[PDB]
């Protein structure tokens, strides 16, 4: 219902200095656009239209951005920030669960001592002469505002801009939409681990590990989401649920346990 | 010259905000010479472009069954908005205009009384929970079953039945594995209807709901 | 009631169940105090498949009482 | 220089079909010399005619306030549709735009638990029921209280509070006359959230909830 | 034009001895050409030079922000001595005076009750206690959780919420392992408030709190 394209921004930091450039990759996986993308860049009461004959828009101008592919609505807006401050908190545009998030914060051609990262306006971690904050496995526990502060040489301690880390799920929580939860004994019922992938992770292959009450049905994981059983007896009528995961098995979501009953 | 039929949105499609009510406008008996049909929809007499149309399907009677469907925002149908399904065809010299809105009438709140199973089916391998839903009007009502916040799909619901006082009543039987009932799980009958407080009511139940937990007398040899 | 039939109830039309069979319901409205007198009631089933083509189940105040003081024996 | 504050619909109205939700953009610091503002409303960038606008409001600080209301059916907002309020003022060097949409986050099922009053408030004349609601996301939740199918109005609800898990929890308190609690009265906590099945869960609580006093009599022969 | 703000001490630190109560006079929008800001710290009518001013800090928007933390002692604050900071900036031709003090109102003693976790919760891994604090005034409470003299850090507390009585109320939830709770540990909810007798109350809560009695009476004969 939402054919909205998306901008993929490289380098992944949404805020950069005045001396750099960033690439705006208007990616529409379905509804592919090799060219003819209307970049509706608005900064201050603007509607600057800069159409390009490719999918990439390398710019260096701050402001709100969005792309318009052929036959598709306008992209979800992305707020760039090209600032010439003294310390800037570099954050990824969008953080998904299980992503290896590195909240770097770097000065403007300076060495910053005693970098201290803040989350929700209180101390999170201390960095001795370090400009990198590392989150191994980002989850819902990691949200809210972030801003690192560090001492300059002798001018002033400086606090960076505030970024909002908002963890989004890579895919909707699975639901075990079996073909018929009341199959007469000896009939095939096709279990479906229904899951709508978030479009930002669309090239991701999904692994659907179906389950009985506690026994792993089938053989481990599989790419296909249709665990077509052949004949169901009164013995194997228990709770059924499926697990969905990405390639490294880092993000694992469990579908709610729906009961399957065999009619006789 | 074609003819215009009409099916109102089903109770489920209008009751839960999760779903979306699709008012459908069945049209049959379309001439072969003029199969292109134009459909107009009115929101109190205002055109709306969002309404789509199923492709015409010729039946075994060599007539094209064209059907028009419009998404309806739930509060609009609930307050009683009037939707005019217009059929345009050059075979008919005039555009047929027909009207549908909410079936007016005073609503009566659905009393809900879920009943635990009797003791003598406990020996049977499948228990049968029950959710009497009585004293409501109209029959624009759906019943769903829940357990730990998840829907149950082994339930059946008898159609609404006219009652002595002119209201309706209906039942719903859930079949569960006897052990699931034995481990004291919670099953809740959720019933949604216009006359309810939030158009939703979830009367719950568990194993031995009725029994007051005071003292159990045991006598052993 | 008490061996003689009465007519205040209603009965839902039979509905197909999951295993291909049917099931239906019968709601008998009684006066609340009349039920509180402990009167015995029975629902009757006249079906072709029954042995004897008849079956009676009786329930009453005590029969469906919550029975907080369950006297459950142990072997 | 005028300012614009855009307020999303309250979480109560976005989940019940009984309530019509709306998003309001205000324009403050409006001088006496510009009593006109033209409001263009975008639904995913598309113009909409249904935006009712309230009259101008006089302010204590020699300015004005113009508010504008757009009625939106809940399926749009719960799908994350953005909204833009366009302000057309002569004092503006250019029109200002503001985007509001439901916050994107992984839904979390709010496990609703009801805690009965302690032994201590029974000396008081008014007990206080409790409806803990832990572990949900986002903080778009409405908690209402009802007894015997009828609403209660003597309740308050703390704003959602971020937990260690990162999912907001929330508390609700029903001040009720102790006599009603001492009799058999069922007070049910009604909760509403995006993540819950059918956007609703109703947890009952009354005097007999979880009294595990069990005189476990065991006669031996 | 720079602006200043005065922040009263946290209610945790103004009622507690081991922690220190601080009053912070913050300034913002201090542009670089006039960055030197000096502080005039009056406790009631007399300047004090115990006030420690942190070094001037630069924000992202290239505006300075300087805080001035004055450490007070608790008798002065609870007696409501009108603290004020007079910030001298070169932009405004005269320094700006901001005065704050304790919330002046009739104190009302909190009536703290504690509630055990619901029996439904007793299946989850982590149970969660509850410490309702009712009917206090003003809205300055520190709530801490203790087990056996060591404080617990797995708790979060809701902000004070205005009640219908005109007082406030605030819940506080502590999550503990079910193993710790089931074995029968004791958890006391310490609440410190100015209207309390000796500014302290502890309500003990343990596994057998919600059980009136338990008679596993046999008769082995
Ligand atoms: C230039 O930037 C500065 C710095 O602002 C910070 O950085 C920028 C990039 C943005 O992200 C800001 O949001 C961020 O704060 C701006 O200075 C800000 O100015 C505004 C408006 O003038 C002030 O708001 C007013 O402040 C108080 C309430 O402040 C409390 O709550 C805020 C929550 O937003 C906190 O940021 C404040 O620190 C403060 O919270 C209290 O702080 C004290 C001291 O540490 C603690 O002891 C307390 O415990 C704590 N309490 C809580 C509940 O957290 C009020 O008068 C009024 O309602 C406004 O909100 C900001 O406070 C101020 N920020 C700072 C850090 O001082 C400038 O405005 C920017 N310049 C321009 C031209 O816009
Ligand atoms: C750095 O931080 C440490 C630890 O808080 C502190 O002792 C030290 O003075 C700081 N040094 C500088 C240069 O800011
Ligand atoms: C017997 O009654 C007690 C107390 O009401 C209850 O806890 C117990 O479950 C009952 N026994 C059965 C088998 O349900
Ligand atoms: C009595 O109640 C206890 C506790 O619920 C239960 O374990 C026991 O089996 C019961 N005894 C009988 C005879 O039902
Ligand atoms: C109650 O008594 C019965 C019979 O002696 C025994 O089996 C059971 O364990 C007891 N239950 C409790 C909770 O004491
Ligand atoms: C209760 O007493 C019975 C003896 O009748 C014993 O078997 C049972 O274990 C006891 N239960 C508890 C919880 O102490």
Q: Cβ distance E167 to E135 under 8 Å?
A: yes
- Alpha-carbon span B207 to C54, nearest angstrom: 31
Neighbours of B204 (CB within 10 A): 18
D198 interfaces chain E, CB cutoff of 8 Å: no
Look up tokens 């839902």; give the residue.
Answer: C12
Neighbours of A220 (CB within 10 A): 7
Half-sphere exposure of C4 (CA within 13 A, CB side): 0
Chain interruptions in chain E, by residue before each (C–N > 2.5 Å): none
Ligand sitting nearest the alpha carbon of A116: 2
CA E188 → CA B208, D45, E114, distances in Å? 34, 55, 9
Which residues, 6+ apart, have CB-to-CB distance to A3 below 8 Å?
A28, A30, A31, A72, A73
Which residue on chain D is closest to A198 by alpha carbon?
A: D106
Q: Is the dihedral of CA D19, D20, D22, D28 positive or negative?
A: negative
Beta-bridge partners for B38: B88
- For ligand 1, the distance from its centroid to the CA atom of residue E64, given in whole angstroms, is 12
Q: Cβ distance E89 to E111 under 8 Å?
A: no
- Alpha-carbon span E66 to E51, nearest angstrom: 13
> Quick one: residue E195, left, alpha or beta (phi over 0 = left, psi -120 to 50 = alpha)?
alpha
Q: Cβ distance D14 to D77 under 8 Å?
A: yes
- The kind and range of the H/E element at E186 are strand E186-192
Tokens of A7: 């901008």
Which of E19, E59, E96 to mutate to test ligand 1, by most ligand atoms within 8 A of the CB atom? E59
Tokens of D181: 């609690």
Which residues, 6+ apart, have CB-to-CB distance to D82 below 8 Å?
D42, D44, D99, D100, D101
> Quick one: residue B111, left, alpha or beta (phi over 0 = left, psi -120 to 50 = alpha)?
beta
Contacting residues of A for C18, CB less than 8 Å apart: 182, 261, 263
**Which regions of E29-125 does DSSP assign to beta strands (E)?**
38-42, 52-53, 57-58, 64-65, 67-71, 83-88, 96-100, 111-115
Neighbours of A63 (CB within 10 A): 16
Contacting residues of D for A143, CB less than 8 Å apart: 162, 166
Look up tokens 């009007």; give the residue.
Answer: B137
A122 burial (CB, 10 Å; 0-12 / 13-18 / 19+) is exposed
CA A114 → CA A124, B113, E65, distances in Å? 13, 66, 19
Query: How many residues in total does chain C contain?
Result: 75
How far, rounded to the nearest angstrom, does the alpha carbon of residue B11 sit from its chain's CA centroid?
3
Neighbours of E34 (CB within 10 A): 12
Half-sphere exposure of A102 (CA within 13 A, CB side): 8
Neighbours of A2 (CB within 10 A): 10
Residue A229 phi, psi (nearest 5): -75, 160
Beta-bridge partners for A163: A146
Contacting residues of B for C62, CB less than 8 Å apart: none
Enter the DSSP assignment of D180: H
3-state secondary structure of B5: coil
Using alpha carbons only, what angle is made at residue A25 by residues A24 and A28, rounded to the nearest 5 degrees? 140
Q: Cβ distance E40 to E95 under 8 Å?
A: yes
Q: Which atom of ligand 1 is nearest to the CA of E24?
A: 44
Task: Report the gap between the CA of B153 and the closest CA in chain A (Å).
Answer: 7
Residue A101 phi, psi (nearest 5): -90, 130
Which residues, 6+ apart, have CB-to-CB distance to E194 below 8 Å?
E15, E78, E107, E138, E140
The dihedral formed by the CA atoms of A25, A28, A29 and A33, expressed in degrees to the nearest 10? -90
Look up tokens 């979501």; give the residue.
Answer: A253
B153 interfaces chain C, CB cutoff of 8 Å: no
- Alpha-carbon span D126 to D117, nearest angstrom: 10
- Alpha-carbon span D153 to D144, nearest angstrom: 9
Tokens of B30: 């379309």
- For ligand 5, the distance from its centroid to the CA atom of residue E216, given in whole angstroms, is 8
Tokens of C75: 């072997």
Tokens of E138: 């003003």
Residue A160 phi, psi (nearest 5): -80, 180
- The kind and range of the H/E element at C27 are strand C26-27
3-state secondary structure of E81: coil
- For ligand 3, the distance from its centroid to the CA atom of residue D156, given in whole angstroms, is 36
Which residues, 6+ apart, have CB-to-CB distance to E121 below 8 Å?
D113, E127, E128
Which residues, 6+ apart, have CB-to-CB distance to A73 below 8 Å?
A2, A3, A4, A5, D44, D45
Could you tell me if the CB of E182 is within 6 A of ligand 1? no
A180 interfaces chain C, CB cutoff of 8 Å: no
Verify D-E touch: 3 or more CB pairs within 8 A: yes
Q: Which of E134, E112, E119, E136 is nearest to E11 (CA)?
A: E136
Contacting residues of D for A168, CB less than 8 Å apart: 104-106
Q: Cβ distance B138 to B103 under 8 Å?
A: yes
Nearest CA to ligand 2 atom 10: A114
Q: Which of E42, E29, E177 is nearest to E100 (CA)?
A: E42
Q: Which of D175, D174, D170, D162 is nearest to D193 (CA)?
A: D170
Would you report the helix, strand and coil content of chain D in percent, each value rounded to 5? 5, 45, 50
C7 interfaces chain B, CB cutoff of 8 Å: no
- Alpha-carbon span D175 to D153, nearest angstrom: 9
């Amino acid at each position: 219902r939402t054919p909205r394209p998306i901008i993929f921004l490289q380098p992944p930091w949404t805020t950069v200095f005045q001396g750099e450039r960033v690439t705006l990759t208007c990616k529409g996986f379905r509804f592919y656009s090799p060219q003819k993308t209307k970049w509706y860049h608005r900064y201050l009461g603007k509607e600057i239209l800069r159409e390009t004959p490719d999918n990439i828009l390398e710019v260096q101008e701050s402001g709100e951005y969005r792309c318009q592919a052929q036959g598709s609505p306008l992209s979800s807006p992305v707020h760039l920030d090209f600032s010439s401050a003294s310390l800037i908190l570099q954050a990824p545009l969008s953080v998904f669960e299980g992503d290896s998030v590195v909240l770097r914060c770097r000065a403007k051609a300076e060495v910053t001592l005693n970098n201290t990262i803040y989350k929700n306006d209180n101390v999170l971690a201390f960095l001795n002469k370090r400009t990198d904050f590392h989150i191994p496995h980002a989850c819902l526990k990691d949200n809210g505002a972030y801003r690192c502060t560090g001492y300059k040489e002798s001018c002033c301690p400086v606090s960076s801009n505030t970024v909002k880390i908002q963890v989004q799920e890579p895919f909707t929580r699975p639901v075990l939409r079996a073909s018929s939860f009341q199959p007469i004994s000896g009939n095939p019922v096709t279990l479906t681990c229904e899951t709508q992938l978030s479009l930002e992770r669309s090239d991701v292959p999904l692994r659907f590990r179906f389950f009985r009450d506690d026994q792993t049905l089938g053989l481990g994981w599989s790419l296909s989401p249709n665990f077509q059983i052949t004949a169901m007896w009164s013995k194997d009528s228990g709770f059924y649920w499926c697990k969905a995961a990405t390639m490294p098995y880092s993000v694992i979501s469990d579908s709610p346990r729906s009961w399957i009953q065999v009619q006789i | 010259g074609p003819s215009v039929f009409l099916f109102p949105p089903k109770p489920k499609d209008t009751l839960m905000i999760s779903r979306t009510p699709e008012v459908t406008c069945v049209v049959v008996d379309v001439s072969h010479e003029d199969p292109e049909v134009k459909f107009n929809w009115y929101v109190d007499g205002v055109e709306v472009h969002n309404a789509k149309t199923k492709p015409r399907e010729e039946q075994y009677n060599s007539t094209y069954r064209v059907v028009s469907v419009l998404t309806v925002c739930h509060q609009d149908w609930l307050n009683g908005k009037e939707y005019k399904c217009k059929v345009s065809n050059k075979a008919l010299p005039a555009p047929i205009e027909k009207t549908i809105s909410k079936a007016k009438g005073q609503p009566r709140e659905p009393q809900v009384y879920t009943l635990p199973p009797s003791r003598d089916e406990l020996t049977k391998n499948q228990v049968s929970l029950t959710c009497l839903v009585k004293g409501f009007y109209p029959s624009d009502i759906a019943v769903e079953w829940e357990s730990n916040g998840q829907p149950e799909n082994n339930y059946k619901t008898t159609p609404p039945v006219l009652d002595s006082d002119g209201s309706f009543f209906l039942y719903s039987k859930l079949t569960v594995d006897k052990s699931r009932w034995q481990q004291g799980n919670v099953f809740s009958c959720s019933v949604m209807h216009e006359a309810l407080h939030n158009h939703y009511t979830q009367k719950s139940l568990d194993k031995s709901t009725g029994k007051p937990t005071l003292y159990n007398v045991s006598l052993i040899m």
